Amino acid sequence: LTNSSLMPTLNPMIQQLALAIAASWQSLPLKPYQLPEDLGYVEGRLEGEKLVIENRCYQTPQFRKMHLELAKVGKGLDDLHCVMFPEPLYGLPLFGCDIVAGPGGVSAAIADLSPTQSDRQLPAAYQKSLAELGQPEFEQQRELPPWGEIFSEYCLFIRPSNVTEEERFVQRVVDFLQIHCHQSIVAEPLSEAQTLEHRQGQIHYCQQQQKNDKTRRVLEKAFGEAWAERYMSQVLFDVI
Numbered sequence: 001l002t003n004s005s006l007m008p009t010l011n012p013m014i015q016q017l018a019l020a021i022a023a024s025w026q027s028l029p030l031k032p033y034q035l036p037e038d039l040g041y042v043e044g045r046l047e048g049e050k051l052v053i054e055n056r057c058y059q060t061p062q063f064r065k066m067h068l069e070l071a072k073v074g075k076g077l078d079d080l081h082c083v084m085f086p087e088p089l090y091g092l093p094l095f096g097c098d099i100v101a102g103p104g105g106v107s108a109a110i111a112d113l114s115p116t117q118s119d120r121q122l123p124a125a126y127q128k129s130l131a132e133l134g135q136p137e138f139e140q141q142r143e144l145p146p147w148g149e150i151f152s153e154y155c156l157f158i159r160p161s162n163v164t165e166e167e168r169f170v171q172r173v174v175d176f177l178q179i180h181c182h183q184s185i186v187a188e189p190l191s192e193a194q195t196l197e198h199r200q201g202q203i204h205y206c207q208q209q210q211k212n213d214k215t216r217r218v219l220e221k222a223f224g225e226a227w228a229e230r231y232m233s234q235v236l237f238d239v240i
């Protein structure tokens with residue numbers, strides 16, 4: 001992240017989360033993943049503020065697509081988006097997070113390990129490791145929208161109330177990533193029917209994430225409807 005244009009000007013929580021994700025991935029058997037049009041940096045404006053986005057994306061044998069995206073709208077909204085899309089053959093859940101901030105602080109902090117099984121449960125080993133973290137206390141919980149049925153029972157969706165809660169959230173993301181990267185070492189290739197089940201779950205996850213009109217409006221205000229539809233369906237939440 002040393003070379004990032006956006007990092008020095010992002011919200012401090014976002015900065016720490018970007019660092020923690022990058023550190024998680026740094027020593028993995030990474031290969032490039034080329035986004036559409038080999039996208040890296042992009043900016044756009046229409047009648048209002050400009051939107052700037054920086055994209056990084058990788059893959060490993062266990063992770064189809066590892067996407068870390070940083071964005072800023074003018075000087076007033078920052079975003080961090082990250083999804084680790086699993087290779088269905090290994091049946092791992094989806095790591096994701098979305099952190100939205102403005103000059104007044106973080107408004108939204110979401111993180112999850114989301115299921116891909118048809119029973120909508122995480123694998124047993126994840127259930128047990130996540131439970132062992134304890135129920136975190138957060139003073140300003142937010143209720144997921146209906147499309148957020150995709151998220152696990154461990155999903156976080158808060159407005160951090162103070163620095164202690166910002167740090168607690170970051171630590172929980174670090175703990176999610178640690179669990180995930182360990183479970184990826186012990187995963188074995190699954191049967192064809194199980195692989196297919198997991199593929200289905202990933203497709204459903206992406207179709208539901210595309211219902212987030214808050215994200216879509218940010219994109220539309222800077223680039224228009226057609227660009228935003230392409231970005232959400234081809235860059236952010238591609239349907240395999």
Ligand SMILES: C=CC1=C(C)/C(=C/c2[nH]c(/C=C3N=C(/C=C4\NC(=O)C(C)=C4C=C)C(C)=C\3CCC(=O)O)c(CCC(=O)O)c2C)NC1=O
Nearest residue numbers: 071079081082083096097098100107108110145214215218
């Ligand atoms: C250019 C990219 C990008 C932008 C600009 C972005 C913006 C964005 N995401 C939001 C919410 C949200 N975002 C999520 C969740 C997620 N979203 C994800 O991209 C992932 C991976 C998850 C979860 C793992 C949820 C659940 C909400 C709340 C939606 C709502 O309030 O209706 C909001 C509303 C913040 C608030 O209400 O305080 C904005 C503006 N998200 C982005 O990804």
